[PDB]
Amino acid sequence: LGINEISSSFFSLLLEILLLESQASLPMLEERVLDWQSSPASSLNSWFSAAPNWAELVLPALQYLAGESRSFSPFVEFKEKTQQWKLLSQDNEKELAALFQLWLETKD
Amino acid sequence: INEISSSFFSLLLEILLLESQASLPMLEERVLDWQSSPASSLNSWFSAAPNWAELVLPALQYLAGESRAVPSSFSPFVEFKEKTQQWKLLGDNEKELAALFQLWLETKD
Ligand code: NA
């Protein structure tokens, strides 16, 4: 997320961090999101107001993106042996945006 | 990493930050290639105009202070040097730029 802090959805934001890291732990993704949400410009994201604390939603977003919610195709996987999240965003943003809204409607 | 920016104004200033200096046709070619990317239409403000590259000059002239629809405490974000024909930034303004962008949208026509 170099240019700026603006992404099409929370889901695309996560997958954009993962494309750059290639692999990443949960604690690292959490810290990246926390730093990201503290930046004044991030509230310019149209979906930023959909939750009060985005860092805390990193795990449940990843699990949904992994297909652990309940034919969807997984965007990420977690490997227990390495404790790393991996990609399995570009051109999928429209789908991710739709899936994000669905998750927001269905999660709580 | 994606073609998403908070406003057309922030998109223009981000292209200037990298580049550091740029000509009008350079900026116009960059915006043309941007708007032709699929990802670009994801910008919430993309549809506020049908052709963004054709608005690069008036946008820059707005951000340069060459337009009267600006607040009293308006400090210009860019300048154009005629001797060089290059646009440059003037040395965390995104929220202000978003608001200024809407001001421009509302007042330009
Ligand atoms: Na962006």
Numbering used by the authors:
A (entry chain B): 370 to 439, 444 to 461, 464 to 483
B (entry chain A): 372 to 462, 466 to 483
Paper text:
The mammalian INO80 complex is composed of three protein modules, one of which consists of proteins specific to metazoa (animals), and not involved in ATP-dependent nucleosome remodeling. Nuclear factor related to kappa-B-binding protein (NFRKB) is a part of this module and modulates the deubiquitinase activity of UCHL5 in the INO80 complex. NFRKB enhances induced pluripotent stem cell generation and knockdown of the NFRKB gene affects the reprogramming process leading to a reduced number of human induced pluripotent stem (iPS) cell colonies.
Based on PsiPred and Disopred sequence analyses, we made 16 constructs that covered various possible boundaries of these three putative domains, and one construct, residues 370–495, produced diffraction-quality crystals. The structure of this domain was determined to 2.18 Å resolution and reveals a novel helical domain (NFRKB_WHL) bearing remarkable similarity to a winged-helix domain, usually associated with DNA binding. The crystal structure of the human NFRKB_WHL domain (residues 370–495) consists of two protomers (residues 372–483 in chain A and 370–483 in chain B), one sodium ion and 25 water molecules in the crystallographic asymmetric unit. The last 12 residues of the construct (residues 484–495) were disordered and were not modeled. The NFRKB_WHL structure adopts a fold similar to the winged-helix DNA binding fold, comprising of four α-helices, three 310-helices and a short β-sheet composed of three β-strands. Therefore, despite the structural similarity to winged-helix DNA binding domains, NFRKB_WHL is unlikely to bind DNA. The sequence of this helix lacks any basic residues, thereby making it unlikely to interact with DNA. The calculated isoelectric point of 4.3 of this domain is also not favorable for DNA binding. NFRKB_WHL has a significant structural similarity (Dali Z-score of 6.7) to one of the winged-helix motifs within the C-terminal domain (CTD) of the cullin protein portion of the of the Cul1–Rbx1–Skp1–F boxSkp2 SCF ubiquitin ligase complex. Thus, it is possible that NFRKB_WHL may be involved in protein-protein interactions rather than DNA binding.
